[PDB]
Amino acid sequence: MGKLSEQLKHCNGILKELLSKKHAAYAWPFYKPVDASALGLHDYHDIIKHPMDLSTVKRKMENRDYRDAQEFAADVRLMFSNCYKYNPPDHDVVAMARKLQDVFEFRYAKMPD
Ligand SMILES: COc1cc2c(cc1OC)[C@@H](C)C(=O)N(C)CC2
Known about the structure:
Homodimer. Interacts with E2F1. Interacts with (acetylated) STAT3; promoting STAT3 recruitment to chromatin. Interacts with CTCF; promoting BRD2 recruitment to chromatin. It is found in: Nucleus; Chromosome. The protein is an all-alpha fold and 113 residues long. Helix content is 64%, strand content 0%. α1 packs antiparallel against α7 (92-108) and α6 runs antiparallel to α7 (92-108).
């Protein structure tokens, strides 16, 4: 239980919060991979080269894929960046991304040193 383990516990706590009922009203678009075909978004995978979502982050955390907090944060921010790249900035889904990213960034900032 070095610094990396302690920081990954903080990351796991954040992940649990992002998936919690407290944030469900704006977190739900990020729960599962974007289903482009189901949504009729036939340009999604031409625009987004590296899809990411909270179920994928959860699988990677469960599989001990993340070696440090920075690697975890990069996936969570990739998920938000994909949303900001693909969707017009006035769309409800972007408002929901902004709100969940505020939750993420303020708690990520409280990382134990
Ligand atoms: C609320 O409407 C939308 C939901 C979703 C998306 C887009 C939506 O509005 C167009 C896709 C493209 C997206 O970025 N995520 C993150 C998944 C779901």
